[PDB]
RNA sequence: ACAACAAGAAGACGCGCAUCA
RNA sequence: GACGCGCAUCAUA
């Protein structure tokens, strides 16, 4: 948090840490490691270093499915600092998995985590909605954007 | 309960969302990024030789009910 | 890894236009609007010119723009609703040149959202409050108010949001000191999405809503609402108060209904309709925009339909009561976005797609012969377009906005290379073609036998405005010649150069000197000889002549000095400085008009050694400081816009160094390998330099900035002005054993263009290899072809004689004899699914036309291409891609077709060979291998020549959707997906089966791509995203693809290619817009220059905050974050900063503004 | 305040006021209460500046001595463009301190 | 009268274990 | 569900 700009050079560092720390062993080292993760993310944008950010979502992801009211609001704080960070592409692909799937707490979930990435930059989800064939009824194809010069 | 910026925004879902309106919402908001754009619209116009004027009345149009009616 | 983003051509595609009193004066001015440049521009009622004074980035999308004034004010400001979530209000100041912002209130979130206020922007006429209003359920008021200070203010918003509503257009309503009143189209929707029955999607008519703002109750409240019949547009705001009354004006389709709250009736008034229309009738009428003039006797409207006519709306009232509404013909102009109204009869066409017209109205259309039209009427009118008659053309800018396809290439026998942009849109296309340079005109011919010099420019006194006497030169004898507007030998001259004149100046009021190796003499206008025999053998080298002084120089390294004497004679100095050099050339500077005369003297030596001399006679002939030359000076001389000092040199170098006594800073360029003399020129009042070379160079200073730009010429020798009746402000350059004319009429900053008219849409066209011709194809949607139209015509024609109206009818032999000009009067827009293409052949080099072909009513041609294939010798086939009944939004195909040509005589006839079926529209057509790859829809195929058709060879399947690009190097072949960003393809030779190997991972609308090496490809995006694509080095020939940059030009990209533009430097990426911009990236060509280019980056973010309040960071990260680029657009703002801030900047940098200047300078001279 | 879950935000039109910051809290940001790089101007609607509500601190609600700014974090994330920041909630935990400090004295 | 203040010490949480019905 | 103990979180005051 402190150095903000300057942790482009340590982030190669501090990963195998992370990754180690982020291991479904205690909630505490969890919620510890996912706020390093926001704070760095949050530091580093700007500077095109999403190799190494990506890496450690495939660790953030897992940690969401928690009770605890401290946890989750750190891995929702990352979460939230990551996707300015990696771009929202990547959130809205992850999100799309289970967003209708037939449980009922899974799905809550993932619309709160649709609606947080939703609110802030709202406008940049135009180019990454996925294509949805229309059924018999309904025109689900946007065509205008199928045009050729 | 710090969740008053999801409740009170437009276009937020919830659980019981069903899929047309999800669909009918990102019609809406495509249609209107489109409208703010200048060289989307451009292209839109320049495609089918139509004018901006024809093109914005037409999406104006469009915005009233799209993806047909609901079941 | 590391780019440099550098703008060569600014956008032209103008958006919105407003006019006002902003600079405070009595001249009106125009500020105009492009996608995210803002531009200030006034026309000269003198001159009848246009001319821009100010241009400044905003770095993002302006949504709106309106202007007003304060109640009793006599300046306006500007306010500006962009994409970021805030309203900002501008003002300009004469003495800055620069725009002030005075607010910024935030209201939201930034970017273009739906509940987001941003997108209509309304205020109050007598300016005491303005609104803003989102899409849907949010608008926002502010008030404004003056303190005691003199100074603009404002309060805190009032809310008036409403769930469920579809605003339309928000315009405000004019009230006589009253509470401020607005007008909306109001439209709900709610009960249209709960019942699945859809009736509720029909019979849902919009509202017409007025607001209220109470300035004692502090809250807006609304009044009325009043159901419409039909579904309008926008709304016009009638002058109220004293001057007409207050009501609004709604178009529709093919009416026009006039509204007021109150007791007042509504009134419907159709649109006239043109005579014998070949349109379809189902086609509905609207209109675009309108204008008004307030002129203080009466007032009236101007609107332009979709076809461009012109009408003149008139109201006539009672004293509380409208009565009716008369709409007249005016005239007919390409349609345009907005229109201008200025006083004393200018009026302003910005057109969405072209040039831009500017026209003086001449007559009003007092009693006019044809009639008019009115609502009284009952029952449908019809008019005949007729030629302008009405409006004078004076002035046309330049704007290249449709850009669609660009190629460059050197096609011309010169070495520099050329640009060939496709441009235009419908009837008015053409093919341009753009050259680095300025725009020369020839204005004179003349052959002079012998070998011409030196010519010279006299005028007769020193306070006339107009040339005397040309003097032209010869080895061995001179032309001596007057300017009569018949130009001929003059004799009683009085001047007798049977020896070579070494300079003609005008020292005296009215007197000569004439400088020749065999001594001096003086020629004054009375009958007096002044001549000063040279003392010895000795002969002349330079001089310098001045305006009340004249130094020469001897052989052996000798200065003598010579000055004008006030009594009327000529003295010399008891002193004579010597040198250890020979003199080669030297200059002396023009006196000032305020201070007594010149001080500084420049002297060039064979030592490369320059010596300031003082002309003050107290330290005459005296050394003041020394600097070191490389090489040996050919020419010198002194700009005067802070004086700088030109060095020119035998060799191709251009030096500038700053005035000072000491030496100082020093920038240099490219010039070459020739002699350069440098040569003062007057342009727009300002003092400027011409220097001669492989290509003509000119500098000078616009808007406080030096520019350096060529000629568009051939080589020179010599050059001078030119002062005239016929020419007030040219340029005399004698040529090889002749005398020219040239002037520079346009200022050609860069990129001069020609254009060729075609006739429909340009879409493609490739370059024949031997012959050097262009094969362009052509495709409109809602067009009739020729065959079409004709028997249309023959059809209506044979309608209205079966009319027989009483037989008495004669029209029809007129109609069928005389048309209208198909460039001005526009096209015929009728049909849903028609099309029409044209194949030309055109010569790049002229602007003939060497073939036509022309395909059936419904094929639309999408593809071409030249090809060899290897079964047959070295034959040059053509192939064309043929659609058959596109329907655009419901989308369905009826079958394709692929044509074939031979292409005899060397690509000057085309011929028909045979055509092939296939199942669906063929989108790209890429040959290799000495065969074609045609992509038909989602299936990639190889195909083969054949006697009767093209034979199938392979094909493939595993392509996700339509294709819509095909790039092919080697043996790997790039597939462009019209949503997947690229697909990588080999072709097995053996087997012969086609297999994927590597894919991309982030989906991409991608429009255009090119292959900068065997292993990067650079693509695009429709919203404007730049990308580049490398393939892992461990890689099996699954394998995902890695991105090494990304960006947001934010503008739509149609074009990429990687090529040297100038020559004797790097390559680089040149990209064109489809708003009229032309750019390119350089990479880096150091890591200390890298990390200087992100310090100044850095502190200009925070430090220099941009006009509109949006971050520029995260307007470069619209859509994915930006990966190693450095924005050239912002770094380049450091020259307009505050004086004392560009300091703070430079010892924050620990440097020198002198040398940030010259460094950021260096890569944008490097690489252009 | 992060810390206190029951805490409730005005969330209204920002108007042109600016708020106050109090001694025991001077550099805290008014959303996530960081110490580091303030950024821009706390505005407050005009419903809280009213009286004896004019010139009282944000958060807690002592004498105004300093201005409220927003961290670069909140800046980046755009929290700040949501509305004011005064909390209008009193807060169970300052009324019960008050609470079992008079009747102890 | 609507009117905010003083340091005998407190606000939200979670993970594990013993006994009983 | 009831009577208890231990550990740990929020730059909590
Ligand atoms: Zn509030
Ligand atoms: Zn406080
Ligand atoms: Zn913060």
């Keep these: 948090e402190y150095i903000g700009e300057m942790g482009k050079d340590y982030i190669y560092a501090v990963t195998p840490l992370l990754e180690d720390a982020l291991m479904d062993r205690d909630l505490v080292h969890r919620q510890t490691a996912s706020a390093v993760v926001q704070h760095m993310s949050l530091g580093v944008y700007g500077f095109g270093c999403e190799d190494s950010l ?15 009211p401290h946890v989750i609001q750190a891995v929702m704080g990352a979460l939230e600092g990551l996707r300015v960070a990696i771009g929202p592409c990547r959130m809205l692909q992850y999100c799309l998995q289970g967003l209708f799937h037939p449980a009922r707490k899974v799905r809550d979930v993932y619309w709160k985590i649709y609606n947080s990435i939703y609110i802030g930059s709202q406008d940049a989800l135009i180019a990454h909605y996925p294509r949805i064939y229309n059924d018999d009824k309904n025109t689900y194809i946007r065509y205008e954007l199928d045009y050729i010069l | 309960q710090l969740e008053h910026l999801q409740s009170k925004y437009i276009g937020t879902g919830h659980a019981d ?22 060289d989307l619209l451009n292209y839109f116009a320049i495609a089918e030789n139509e004018s901006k004027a024809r093109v914005r009345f037409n999406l104006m149009e469009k915005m009233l009910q799209p993806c047909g009616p609901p079941a | 890894m590391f780019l440099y983003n550098l703008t060569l051509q600014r956008a032209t595609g103008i958006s919105f236009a407003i006019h006002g009193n902003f600079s405070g004066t009595k001249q009106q001015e125009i500020v105009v609007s492009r996608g995210k440049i803002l531009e200030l521009l006034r026309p000269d009622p003198n001159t009848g010119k246009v001319h821009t004074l100010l241009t400044v980035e905003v770095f993002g999308v302006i949504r709106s723009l309106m202007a007003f004034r304060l109640t009793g004010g006599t300046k306006d400001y500007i306010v500006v609703g962009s994409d970021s979530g805030r309203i900002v209000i501008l ?37 005491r409050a303005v609104m803003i209003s989102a899409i849907e359920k949010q608008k926002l008021v502010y008030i404004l108010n003056r303190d005691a200070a003199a100074r603009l203010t404002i309060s805190s918003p009032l809310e008036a949001h409403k769930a469920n509503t579809l605003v339309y257009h928000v315009v405000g309503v004019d009230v006589g000191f009253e509470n401020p009143m607005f007008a909306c189209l109001e439209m709900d929707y709610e009960e249209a999405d709960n019942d699945p029955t859809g009736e509720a999607a029909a019979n849902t008519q919009q509202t017409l809503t007025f607001y209220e703002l109470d300035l004692g109750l502090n809250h807006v409240v609304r009044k009325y609402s009043e159901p419409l019949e039909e579904h309008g547009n926008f709304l016009i705001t009638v002058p109220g108060g004293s001057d007409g009354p207050s009501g609004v004006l709604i178009c529709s389709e093919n009416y026009i209904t006039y509204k007021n709250f109150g007791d007042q009736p509504d009134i419907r008034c159709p649109i006239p309709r043109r005579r014998n229309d070949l349109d379809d009738p189902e086609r509905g009428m609207i209109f675009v925009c309108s204008a008004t003039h307030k002129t203080k006797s009466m007032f009236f409207f101007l609107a332009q339909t979709e076809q461009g006519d012109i009408f003149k709306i008139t109201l006539e009232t009672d004293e509380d009561m409208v009565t009716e509404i008369r709409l ?15 006083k004393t009869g200018f009026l302003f066409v910005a057109s969405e797609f072209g040039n831009h017209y500017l026209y003086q109205i001449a007559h009003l259309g007092d009693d006019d012969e044809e009639p008019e039209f009115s609502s009284a009427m009952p029952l449908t009118f019809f008019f005949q377009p007729r030629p302008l008659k009405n409006l004078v053309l004076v002035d046309e800018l330049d704007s290249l906005s449709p850009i669609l396809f660009c190629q460059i290439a050197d096609l011309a026998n010169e070495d520099t290379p050329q640009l060939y942009v496709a441009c235009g849109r419908g009837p008015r296309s053409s093919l341009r073609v753009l050259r680095h340079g300025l725009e020369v005109s020839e204005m004179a011919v003349s052959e002079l036998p012998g070998n011409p010099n030196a010519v010279w420019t006299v005028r007769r006194h020193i306070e006339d405005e107009f040339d005397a006497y040309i003097i032209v030169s010869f080895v061995n004898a001179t032309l001596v010649l007057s300017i009569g507007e018949t130009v001929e030998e003059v004799t009683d001259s009085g001047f007798l150069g049977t020896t070579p004149t070494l300079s003609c100046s005008l020292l005296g009021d009215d007197a000569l000197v004439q400088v020749y190796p065999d001594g001096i003499r003086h020629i004054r206008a009375d009958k007096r000889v002044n001549e000063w025999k040279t003392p010895g053998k000795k002969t002349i080298v330079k001089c310098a002549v001045n305006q009340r002084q004249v130094v020469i120089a001897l052989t052996g390294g000798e200065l003598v000095y010579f000055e004008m004497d006030p009594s009327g004679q000529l003295n010399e100095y008891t002193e004579r400085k010597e040198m250890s050099a020979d003199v080669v050339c030297m200059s002396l500077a023009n006196v000032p008009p305020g201070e007594q005369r010149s001080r500084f003297l420049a002297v060039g030596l064979v030592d490369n050694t320059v010596r300031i001399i003082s002309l003050d006679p107290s330290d005459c002939l005296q050394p003041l400081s020394m600097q070191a030359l490389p090489a040996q000076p050919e020419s010198l001389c002194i700009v005067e816009m802070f004086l700088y000092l030109n060095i020119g040199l035998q060799n191709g170098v251009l030096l500038r160094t700053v005035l000072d006594p000491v030496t100082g800073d020093l920038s240099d360029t490219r010039t070459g390998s020739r002699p350069v003399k440098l040569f003062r020129v007057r342009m727009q009042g300002q003092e400027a330099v011409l220097a001669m070379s492989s290509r003509s160079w000119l500098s000078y200073s616009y808007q406080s900035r030096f520019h350096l730009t060529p000629l568009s010429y051939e080589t020179l020798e010599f050059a001078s002005g030119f002062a005239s009746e016929q020419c007030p402000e040219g340029i005399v350059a004698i040529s090889t054993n002749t005398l020219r004319i040239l002037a520079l009429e346009k200022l050609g900053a860069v990129f001069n263009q020609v254009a060729f008219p075609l006739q429909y849409t340009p879409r493609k066209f490739v370059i024949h290899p031997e012959s050097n011709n262009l094969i362009i194809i052509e495709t409109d949607h809602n067009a009739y072809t020729e065959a079409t139209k004709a028997q249309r015509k023959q059809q209506m024609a044979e309608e209205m004689v079966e009319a027989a109206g009483e037989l008495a009818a004669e029209m029809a032999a007129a109609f069928l004899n005389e048309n209208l000009p198909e460039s001005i009067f526009g096209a015929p827009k009728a049909g849903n699914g028609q099309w029409a293409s044209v194949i030309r052949v055109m010569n790049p080099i002229q602007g003939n036309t060497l073939d036509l072909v022309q395909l059936e009513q419904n094929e639309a041609a999408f593809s071409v291409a030249v090809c060899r294939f290897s079964n047959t010798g070295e034959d040059w086939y053509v192939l064309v891609g043929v659609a058959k009944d596109l329907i655009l939004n419901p989308r369905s195909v009826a079958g394709g077709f692929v044509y074939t040509y031979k292409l005899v005589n060397n690509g000057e006839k085309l011929e028909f060979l045979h055509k092939t079926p296939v199942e669906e529209v063929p989108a790209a057509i890429a040959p290799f291998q000495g065969r074609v790859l045609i992509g038909v829809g989602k299936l990639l195929r190889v195909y083969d020549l054949g006697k009767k058709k093209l034979l199938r060879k392979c094909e493939n399947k595993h392509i996700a959707n339509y294709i819509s690009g095909i790039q092919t190097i080697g043996h790997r072949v790039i597939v462009s997906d019209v949503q997947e960003s690229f697909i990588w393809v080999r072709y097995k030779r053996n087997e012969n089966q086609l297999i994927i190997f590597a894919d991309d991972t982030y989906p991409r609308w991608v429009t255009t791509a090119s292959l900068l090496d065997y292993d990067t490809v650079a693509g695009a995006d429709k919203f404007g995203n730049i990308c580049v694509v490398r393939l892992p080095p461990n890689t099996n020939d699954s394998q995902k693809a890695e991105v090494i940059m990304n960006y947001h030009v934010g503008e739509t990209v149609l074009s990429l290619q990687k090529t040297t533009l100038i020559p004797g430097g790097s390559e680089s990426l040149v990209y064109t817009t489809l708003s009229g911009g032309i750019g390119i990236l350089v990479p880096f060509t150091s890591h200390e220059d890298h990390d200087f280019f992100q310090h100044v980056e850095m502190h200009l973010r925070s430090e220099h905050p941009p006009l509109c309040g949006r971050d520029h960071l995260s307007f470069r990260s619209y859509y994915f974050p930006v990966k190693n680029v450095i924005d050239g657009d912002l770094c380049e703002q450091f020259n307009s900063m505050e004086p004392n801030k560009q300091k703070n900047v430079s010892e924050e940098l620990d440097r020198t503004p002198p040398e940030v200047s010259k460094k950021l300078e260096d890569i944008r001279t490097r690489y252009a | 305040a992060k810390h206190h879950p029951d805490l409730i935000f005005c969330r209204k039109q920002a108007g042109v006021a600016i708020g106050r910051l109090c001694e025991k809290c001077d550099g805290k940001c008014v959303i996530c209460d960081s110490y580091v790089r303030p950024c821009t101007l706390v505005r407050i609607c005009d419903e809280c500046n009213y009286g004896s509500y004019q010139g009282r601190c944000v958060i807690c609600g002592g004498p105004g001595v300093s201005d409220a700014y927003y961290c670069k974090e909140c800046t980046i994330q755009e929290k700040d463009r949501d509305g004011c920041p005064k909390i209008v909630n009193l807060g169970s935990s300052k009324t019960d301190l008050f609470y079992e400090r008079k009747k102890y004295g």
């Design chain 1, 54 to 68: 990506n890496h450690l979502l495939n660790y953030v992801w897992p940690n969401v499915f928690e009770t605890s």
């Design chain 3, 91 to 127: 003002e300009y100041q004469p003495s800055k040149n620069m725009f002030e912002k005075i607010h910024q209130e935030t209201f939201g979130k930034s970017g273009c959202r739906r509940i987001v206020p941003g997108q209509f922007l309304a205020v109050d006429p007598k300016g």
């Design chain 3, 328 to 342: 007249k013909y005016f005239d007919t102009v390409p349609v345009a976005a907005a229109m201008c109204v200025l």
């Design chain 2, 17 to 38: 969302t069903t899929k047309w309106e999800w669909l009918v919402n990102q019609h809406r908001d495509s249609y209107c990024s489109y409208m703010g754009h200048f």
